[PDB]
Copies of this chain bind each other. A is one copy, B any other.
Amino acid sequence: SDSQQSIKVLEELFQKLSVATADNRHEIASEVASFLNGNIIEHDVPEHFFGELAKGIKDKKTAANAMQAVAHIANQSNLSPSVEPYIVQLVPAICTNAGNKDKEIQSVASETLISIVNAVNPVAIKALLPHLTNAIVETNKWQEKIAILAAFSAMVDAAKDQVALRMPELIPVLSETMWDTKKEVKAAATAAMTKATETVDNKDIERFIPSLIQCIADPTEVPETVHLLGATTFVAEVTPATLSIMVPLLSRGLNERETGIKRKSAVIIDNMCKLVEDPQVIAPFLGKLLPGLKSNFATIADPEAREVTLRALKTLRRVGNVGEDDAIPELSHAGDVSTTLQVVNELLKDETVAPRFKIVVEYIAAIGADLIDERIIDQQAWFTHITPYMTIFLHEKKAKDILDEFRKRAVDNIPVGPNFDDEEDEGEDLCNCEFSLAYGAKILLNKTQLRLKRARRYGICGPNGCGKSTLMRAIANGQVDGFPTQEECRTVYVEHDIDGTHSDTSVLDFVFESGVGTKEAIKDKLIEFGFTDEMIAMPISALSGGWKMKLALARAVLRNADILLLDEPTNHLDTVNVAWLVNYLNTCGITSITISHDSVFLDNVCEYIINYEGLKLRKYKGNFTEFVKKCPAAKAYEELSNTDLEFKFPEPGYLEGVKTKQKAIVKVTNMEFQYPGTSKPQITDINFQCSLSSRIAVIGPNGAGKSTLINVLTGELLPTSGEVYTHENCRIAYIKQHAFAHIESHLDKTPSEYIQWRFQTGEDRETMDRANRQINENDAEAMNKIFKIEGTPRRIAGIHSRRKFKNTYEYECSFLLGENIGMKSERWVPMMSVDNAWIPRGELVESHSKMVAEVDMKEALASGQFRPLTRKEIEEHCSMLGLDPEIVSHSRIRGLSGGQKVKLVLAAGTWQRPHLIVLDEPTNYLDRDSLGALSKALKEFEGGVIIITHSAEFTKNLTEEVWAVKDGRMTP
């Protein structure tokens, strides 16, 4: 019913929008957006509304208003998943208008595409990109292309990782467009191309990108560029993105007349491709290289060049895993939308899914396919991204049950990665033995293989109690069948030696009694490692952690080790020493094998990982994190990364005057809100209080009332009437699902840089200003916005102060008065502070976010509520929320589990140590485990808690005050 009320509101608002003028258009669109994006409907969609919007976009008479509405709805921080798939379904239509002859419809369409690209869940890229590529290749309107190219570029920033995986499909499209007859398009397409290549992210060829882009536009540079790339030393991962910009050049190189170039192309092909682990990556590129390689093999007279051609052809066949007759193996379809659409349609066969929800099911399949492509398989991840879309037409319980099955079936389609192959012989082998390892009648390893390459650095991982250290003892003590003898391959089990020295023997004497060398030689090496003449005379008993390690490694150089064996080497080592060790191992030139619960330390040292899988040893190229992608089974090892446990919210910042916890810090009376343009208010006669003891539950079905109330509570809507008392410095943290899903856009950031990113303007860019486009962070001419105060046109001279105004902030602005506007004598004169005015944040944020931010920092400091973004403080705060400092400061969010992301997003939301935590529908995107931890933490929060849920179970022990809107009213 309150749900059905939302429908009437939309009709009134839409009716208002349909007749909007070019001057009031934005105002009305914003209303539609603030309302439409809330919890206004119960398990359904505003159908008539979306039907009118679509028909409104097509009709030239209403095209600009309808689309402008779509743009506001598609804002960066508030686009609701309940409406998201119905918005993307309008892209084809909007792309069409981007080709319209009318200068205004074309413009508004272009901007709207950019807005949509910036608002959708980055993971639902597979539902959006196709519309854009379909349009750009099918249209004959050059302006429509320039716009679509603009949207591609925007997508690169909004979903860099997601785009990286679509590169093999996007590059061909951009390349063709670069050869468009229209010169403006040629310009736009190159620009979108240089932008697209930003997803490559490969240090080995980075500097050669601007060269590669030119070859696309001018094939005559092929020979010149092929030669430039001959110097490249491929070491980094050869991803689909790297191939999409490397292969087309190479392919043309193979077809050149000159033999030297055919050869040079073959060299690069070999060098690069021998670095492809998954035959899936190179599969779609083989057809562009094999034919040129076989043809060159039967045309090149010179034996040396021919041998190089064949050498490349073999690598390709190996890597690509081709069959007989160069038959390319069938590609996996795990990540195909078509495949996931089938999987979900099967799980919904018994459910009755009405026609208007079909587009939603498609969105779900799209999200699923991408999650599988990025190999995001953990439960919480899937719940975070898909649950809210299913509940559009299903009850939560059933939704989560089907979602988890969907995830399990989709995940099941991921092809098994092929066993690692050793064509990486840069230097000789240290060992290569077949053996078994038995420990007291217990079999640890059975007929496994061990091959270690010289100067390579390895890490040994495995399940607790599998013999990780027994294997090392065995290698150290010459007890591994086949392993070389100390004479051939000298190993030094660092810091694990055993002698009979006393606790009063000097460091020099100690080493000396080992026979390694002369006292002169020893002293020389000890000094080179940092030991002072004094330290060398003191008794070993006085060596601290860092120096025993330096001594150990110094002795190892004296014995002339070939392999350094380290077992938990970072223990008793301060950060400076660990960094010292990471550095030394990475530059000593000797091979090392390491065991260590410190995943970050493994990531900075290791190049390969020897993992225990049953009674077999399996190698994986890459450090620990890389390894984990290839073997998700390892997300259960006892390695710093995998550690996950409950968390706690921070203590709310001290409030002056608040004697007791029942003392109201928020008090609302006779409040009411009525959207301008509607015939009756959405909520009226509202009264409520909040204290640090509040334990409120906002229940009931979604609707005009419930959503609007919440929208006012959270600061999004300024009430139309009523009194609002907020204690000075009172702060609210609004935990929405949006932040959880949108973190996937920052996978290359570290948890620390993310929190810094979310508070770049002093305020939380995820919850503050949800009623504004804000899609104007890259602009400076829109700072000349003409405000209308008292009937006069004024520009902003400056913002000087701030103050609470109801549920938002007002800012003291000094203006410039516009005189003789539109004339050669136009001039803006400064108005003395007599005319300053208190403008609400919402009216400034779009045009003057900068000045507003500067003023916000001034006030935060002034009142002692500013929390500086220092690494230490960020680290300390993330620790409360159960995230380890090393991960927070030196790991990429890309490697965090779904659950860890929940923690990180939660940490960001509570960074300003809020006094009140309002949580919107937090069962609608969290799983059983997550809710358990969120329940315990919300129970111990020394601040006020407001939970808006549909779940009765979740209110258990978390509520003591009920809020329920009925007919636009509510009494606690």
Q: Which residues of A contact B (CB under 8 A)?
A: 146, 183-184, 186-188, 190-191, 193-195, 197-198, 207-211, 213-215, 217-218, 220-221, 223-225, 227-228, 230-231, 233, 260, 263-264, 267, 271, 301, 303-304, 306-308, 426-428, 454-455, 517-518, 520-521, 524-525, 527-530, 557-558, 560, 575-576, 580, 583-584, 587-590, 651, 653-654, 656, 777-778, 780-781, 784, 798, 800, 821-824, 826-828, 850, 854, 857-858, 860-862, 864, 866-873, 876, 913
Chain B's closest residue to A212 (CB) is B210
A824 to B298, CA, bound (A): 10
Residues of B within 8 A of A213 (CB): 210, 214
A314 to chain B, nearest CB (A): 13
A409 to chain B, nearest CB (A): 41
Task: Tell whether, in the assembled complex, residue A211 and residue B224 are in contact, meaning their CB atoms are under 8 Å apart.
Answer: no
A489 to chain B, nearest CB (A): 12
Residues of B within 8 A of A872 (CB): 530, 580, 583
A427 to B858, CA, bound (A): 10
A731 to chain B, nearest CB (A): 14
A573 to chain B, nearest CB (A): 14
Q: Which of B260, B428, B850 contacts A781 (CB 8 A)?
A: B260
With A215-B187, A218-B190, A854-B427 already in contact, the answer to whether A870 and B521 are too (CB < 8 A) is no
Task: Tell whether, in the assembled complex, residue A520 and residue B822 are in contact, meaning their CB atoms are under 8 Å apart.
Answer: no
- For the complex of A and B, the 8 pairs showing the least CB-CB separation, nearest first, are A231-B778, A524-B654, A187-B224, A184-B224, A187-B220, A187-B221, A587-B868, A210-B213
Task: Tell whether, in the assembled complex, residue B656 and residue A218 are in contact, meaning their CB atoms are under 8 Å apart.
Answer: no
Task: Tell whether, in the assembled complex, residue A861 and residue B590 are in contact, meaning their CB atoms are under 8 Å apart.
Answer: yes
A102 to chain B, nearest CB (A): 16
Task: Tell whether, in the assembled complex, residue A210 and residue B207 are in contact, meaning their CB atoms are under 8 Å apart.
Answer: no
Residues of B within 8 A of A184 (CB): 220-221, 223-224
Task: Tell whether, in the assembled complex, residue A850 and residue B426 are in contact, meaning their CB atoms are under 8 Å apart.
Answer: yes
With A183-B224, A214-B190, A303-B827 already in contact, the answer to whether A525 and B864 are too (CB < 8 A) is yes
Residues of B within 8 A of A580 (CB): 870, 872
Selected A-B contacts with CB under 8 Å, 23 pairs: A184-B223, A184-B224, A190-B211, A190-B214, A191-B224, A194-B210, A195-B207, A214-B217, A230-B780, A233-B780, A303-B824, A303-B826, A304-B784, A426-B850, A428-B854, A521-B656, A530-B872, A557-B861, A576-B576, A584-B870, A588-B866, A589-B866, A589-B868
A656 to B822, CA, bound (A): 90
- Centre residue among A303, A560, A587 by max chain B CB count within 10 A: A303
A70 to chain B, nearest CB (A): 22
Residues of B within 8 A of A193 (CB): 210
Task: Tell whether, in the assembled complex, residue B864 and residue A558 are in contact, meaning their CB atoms are under 8 Å apart.
Answer: yes
Task: Tell whether, in the assembled complex, residue A224 and residue B455 are in contact, meaning their CB atoms are under 8 Å apart.
Answer: no
Chain B's closest residue to A233 (CB) is B778
Task: Tell whether, in the assembled complex, residue B854 and residue A426 are in contact, meaning their CB atoms are under 8 Å apart.
Answer: yes
Task: Tell whether, in the assembled complex, residue B211 and residue A194 are in contact, meaning their CB atoms are under 8 Å apart.
Answer: yes
Task: Tell whether, in the assembled complex, residue A194 and residue B220 are in contact, meaning their CB atoms are under 8 Å apart.
Answer: no
Residues of B within 8 A of A557 (CB): 861, 864, 866
Residues of B within 8 A of A654 (CB): 520-521, 524-525
Task: Tell whether, in the assembled complex, residue A864 and residue B517 are in contact, meaning their CB atoms are under 8 Å apart.
Answer: yes
Q: Which of B207, B583, B857 contacts A194 (CB 8 A)?
A: B207
Residues of B within 8 A of A876 (CB): 530
Task: Tell whether, in the assembled complex, residue B187 and residue A778 are in contact, meaning their CB atoms are under 8 Å apart.
Answer: no
With A303-B826, A528-B913 already in contact, the answer to whether A267 and B780 are too (CB < 8 A) is yes
Residues of B within 8 A of A263 (CB): 781
A692 to chain B, nearest CB (A): 13
Task: Tell whether, in the assembled complex, residue B587 and residue A869 are in contact, meaning their CB atoms are under 8 Å apart.
Answer: yes
Residues of B within 8 A of A587 (CB): 868-870
Residues of B within 8 A of A209 (CB): 194, 210
Chain B's closest residue to A580 (CB) is B872
Chain B's closest residue to A184 (CB) is B224
Task: Tell whether, in the assembled complex, residue A780 and residue B271 are in contact, meaning their CB atoms are under 8 Å apart.
Answer: yes
Residues of B within 8 A of A823 (CB): 303
Task: Tell whether, in the assembled complex, residue B191 and residue A868 are in contact, meaning their CB atoms are under 8 Å apart.
Answer: no
A249 to chain B, nearest CB (A): 11
A695 to chain B, nearest CB (A): 23
Task: Tell whether, in the assembled complex, residue A230 and residue B517 are in contact, meaning their CB atoms are under 8 Å apart.
Answer: no
Q: Which of B224, B307, B777, B857 contacts A826 (CB 8 A)?
A: B307
Task: Tell whether, in the assembled complex, residue B267 and residue A781 are in contact, meaning their CB atoms are under 8 Å apart.
Answer: yes
Task: Tell whether, in the assembled complex, residue B575 and residue A188 are in contact, meaning their CB atoms are under 8 Å apart.
Answer: no
A861 to B562, CA, bound (A): 9
With A303-B822, A864-B560 already in contact, the answer to whether A873 and B528 are too (CB < 8 A) is yes
Residues of B within 8 A of A656 (CB): 517-518, 521
With A231-B777, A777-B231, A868-B588 already in contact, the answer to whether A210 and B221 are too (CB < 8 A) is no
A727 to chain B, nearest CB (A): 14
With A187-B228, A822-B303 already in contact, the answer to whether A560 and B214 are too (CB < 8 A) is no
With A307-B826, A427-B854, A528-B873 already in contact, the answer to whether A221 and B186 are too (CB < 8 A) is yes
A580 to B198, CA, bound (A): 33
Residues of B within 8 A of A784 (CB): 304
Task: Tell whether, in the assembled complex, residue B191 and residue A208 are in contact, meaning their CB atoms are under 8 Å apart.
Answer: yes
Residues of B within 8 A of A798 (CB): 428
Residues of B within 8 A of A217 (CB): 214
Q: Which of B225, B584, B781 contacts A187 (CB 8 A)?
A: B225
Task: Tell whether, in the assembled complex, residue B864 and residue A191 are in contact, meaning their CB atoms are under 8 Å apart.
Answer: no
A454 to B527, CA, bound (A): 50
A396 to B824, CA, bound (A): 69
A221 to B210, CA, bound (A): 14
A429 to chain B, nearest CB (A): 11
Chain B's closest residue to A221 (CB) is B187
Task: Tell whether, in the assembled complex, residue A304 and residue B828 are in contact, meaning their CB atoms are under 8 Å apart.
Answer: yes
A933 to chain B, nearest CB (A): 24
A798 to B425, CA, bound (A): 14
A431 to chain B, nearest CB (A): 15
A521 to B658, CA, bound (A): 11
**What would 17 more interface pairs be, CB under 8 Å, given A186-B220, A303-B823, A428-B798?**
A146-B224, A183-B218, A187-B225, A191-B221, A209-B210, A267-B780, A301-B824, A303-B824, A304-B784, A306-B826, A454-B854, A455-B857, A518-B656, A525-B654, A528-B867, A557-B864, A580-B870
